[PDB]
Structures are given as C-alpha cells and as structure tokens.
Design a protein around this ligand. Sequence first.
Ligand SMILES: O=C(CO)[C@H](O)[C@H](O)COP(=O)(O)O
Ligand SMILES: O=C(CO)[C@H](O)[C@H](O)COP(=O)(O)O
Ligand SMILES: [Ca+2]
Ligand SMILES: [Ca+2]
Ligand SMILES: [Ca+2]
Ligand SMILES: [Ca+2]
Ligand SMILES: [Zn+2]
Ligand SMILES: [Zn+2]
Ligand SMILES: [Zn+2]
Lengths: 219, 219
Amino acid sequence: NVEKAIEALKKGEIILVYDSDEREGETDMVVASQFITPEHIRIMRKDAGGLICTALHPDICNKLGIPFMVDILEFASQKFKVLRELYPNDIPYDEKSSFSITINHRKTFTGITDNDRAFTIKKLAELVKEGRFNDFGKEFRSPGSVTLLRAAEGLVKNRQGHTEMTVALAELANLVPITTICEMMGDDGNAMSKNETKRYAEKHNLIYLSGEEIINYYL
Amino acid sequence: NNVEKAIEALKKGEIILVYDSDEREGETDMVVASQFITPEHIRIMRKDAGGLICTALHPDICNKLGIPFMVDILEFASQKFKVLRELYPNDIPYDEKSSFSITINHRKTFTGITDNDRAFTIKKLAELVKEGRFNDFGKEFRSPGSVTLLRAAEGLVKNRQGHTEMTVALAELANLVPITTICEMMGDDGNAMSKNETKRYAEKHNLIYLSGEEIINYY
Ligand SMILES: O=C(CO)[C@H](O)[C@H](O)COP(=O)(O)O
Ligand SMILES: O=C(CO)[C@H](O)[C@H](O)COP(=O)(O)O
Ligand SMILES: [Ca+2]
Ligand SMILES: [Ca+2]
Ligand SMILES: [Ca+2]
Ligand SMILES: [Ca+2]
Ligand SMILES: [Zn+2]
Ligand SMILES: [Zn+2]
Ligand SMILES: [Zn+2]
C-alpha cells in the first residue's frame, strides 16, 4: 500500500493519510509540495477544510533556520508576557505542535488565493530542491497565509503526526521532503471519520493510507 | 441605510459580506459577530468563502489582554532566530501593516480545527471579554492554535481601512462585543471571488453586502 501511494505522490496526486484511532483520528489530504497546483488548494479548501499547511523535513528547516513557533513565543514571552500565560503546558508530548512560521512569497498580493498559496508553496519547494537556502528571506515574508510545519528530528521515530508521516512518505518516494496537507472536516462539526474519508478516496479514485503502514514501512 | 441593515443582521447572528475597495485588496470577506458564532458559520465559511478564518479584536480588548501584533513578536524574536529578520514584511503590497496577531485554541478543545472546536474557541473568547474576565485568558487558552487573531488598529477606520477595522467598527456601532470573525471569499479560477460573483452570492442568500467606503463614512 505504501509503494502504491508513493507512485501516486510521484504523479502529483492527492493521497489521503489517516493518523490513528489513538491520536487525532484525523485524515489529511496530502500532496508532494513540488507538484502543488492551484487546483489542489481549491480541492483542499472545499473538500478538506482545515488549515492548509506545508510540512518540511528537519534537515530543510535546519538549513533555512526555521524554528517551532512555540520556541519563537517562549523567547518573546520575555517582552510580551501574555505569551507565557498562553503556554501549551497541558498538551501530551505526543501531540506537541509541529507549527512553525507563516509565509507568503513576496511576489504574491494578499497571499490567500489558490494561485497565491500554490505559488508560495511551489516556489518554496523549488528554492529547497535547488539548494538556494540564502534566498529564503529574499523571496518570502512572514507572517502570511501559508502555515509551515517543522517535522521532528528522526521523523516517525520520534513523532507520529501527519507532519512526520507525510514527510517520511515524500522521503521514501525520493522526492523533495516537503508536503502540503489539510485536515478533512465533517458536516457534523467534527473531523471526518475514517469511514468517511475512505469513502471519499474511493469516490475520487485516490489512495487512502493508514499512518501505521507508513511508520512500519519507514522503520 | 445598508450599514444599518448590516448592523441589524449582525445583531441577529447572521453573516454579512464586506468588500474593502478596488484600490486595496479587492476582496470580500464573509463576516459574523464572534459572540454569536456557531459551528454552522465556520462550516459555511470554509465551504463557501475558503480563505483563512480569523477573529478580529478591538485594540481596547487587545491592550487589556496584552495581545501584540505578530510582526512585533517576530521582530523581538529575531534577536535569537536570525531567519526572522530576513522575512520582515516591509513590503506588504496593499497597506502599511498586517493585522495578524497570535493564534489560539481554547484549552478544552482537542485538535482545535473542527467546526465545533473553532466555534467554541471563538465564542468562549467573546464571552470572556464580555464578562470582563481578562485575568482568565491564559487559564482558558493556549498558543499556537487553529484560530488566528487579528488586532485592529488604534482608532479603527480612522487609521487603517482593512476588513479588520471595518468589521470591528460595525460590531461597535451595533453595541456588540467588538470582536468579529471573517473569511475571504475565493473563486474557482484561483483568484479571489470577483465583485460580481460575491454580489450574486449575496443576492442568492439574501445577505447584506457592504463596500468599505460606506462603512468608513458611516462610522
Ligand atoms: O495540526 C495540524 C495542522 O495545523 C494537523 O494535525 C496536521 O495533520 C499536522 O499536524 P500533526 O503532525 O500533529 O498531525
Ligand atoms: O489578512 C486577512 C486574513 O488574515 C484578510 O485580509 C482579512 O480581511 C483581514 O485583513 P485586512 O484588515 O487587511 O483586510
Ligand atoms: Ca496536529
Ligand atoms: Ca489582509
Ligand atoms: Ca493605511
Ligand atoms: Ca434574493
Ligand atoms: Zn494531523
Ligand atoms: Zn481583508
Ligand atoms: Zn442561503
């Protein structure tokens, strides 16, 4: 199943990845960022509905100098004390946020359109694939509409969220290890259930993958 | 006229549409008074508008809670994270500054992104403010989260004319807690939904549609 998903990812398709019954119980739509298109963004906002985020392998984040947002906030809590009052000291270690900074490519206008978000994401994957790390500040500004996620060092060995699972899948596919993901939201106000997301994958001829399978394959 | 009609709609917990200006973003946001937000509002915003779902706060509330602008958090944190300096938004194309602030989740939510979770976070924030329980902010919320806050400029539309200021101004005029939730309407072609298409939406759904100039002049 993992290898079939890898082929789909290599063709620029959206695949569906469920994490686990014990974790978020959520399914994310996932695409290899180097193949992102405005159409992928349109499908994610209409049929998934969560935040459209782009996850990056830790090696990439280290080359760009991008930290976890929690660390930006903790340091800034020295000046803005409310940040200390909002510390996420109550989240299980396994669910600790993978949130990093938000960005827009400088050539975009408001940054939120399908065209703007696909351009921001595709240009970031381009810059990374080409190794033009120093061009990051030249080409992008923060804050913006595309939320970046920082994958755990060691990926699924140390954290088992969609952030790590999808980046691990891109690494396995021999692609730039950067993915764009969006949580699938249900009409009942909760996340779409695994039965509901498997159903959507069947209707749209998409690959549906369980996180356990990616983890096992990777390890 | 239409502004008074939009005010009555907000007081009833309905959504209104606000277009800023041809000379600014050229975008229409769906708008609702946060104290009346429901999971259904979040659902219609993600399916029918599609941009980010953000909650704008009157600067008075922001000062009482100690919530700063995000660019300021980044500016201060750049002392430690050098990448932040190179990402300065000294070039946002449609205004001097962004209204982006911190992101939050109410501590009682699970993943924070569902319609139920986002509506709960936003409504609870509006309630905490309405009840003057500012010392309870950290007790009830954590950052980062799925709900992005926006800080309205001091003087509102007298000093900045974004949807952030315009909508907070309408909530104030309505004698409501001045906190709004807004979402940009996106088009199928990859650009923001056109003025003509957002008008057709407003006519189909009998929603009040306002332009920025009318709100600014009335305020
Ligand atoms: O938080 C999220 C996006 O903002 C989603 O849960 C997304 O799937 C990435 O997070 P995680 O790695 O915890 O699954
Ligand atoms: O940026 C945005 C959301 O994050 C949107 O533009 C929203 O309408 C608020 O911004 P502004 O006050 O500039 O119109
Ligand atoms: Ca998560
Ligand atoms: Ca804006
Ligand atoms: Ca201005
Ligand atoms: Ca009508
Ligand atoms: Zn997830
Ligand atoms: Zn706007
Ligand atoms: Zn209707």
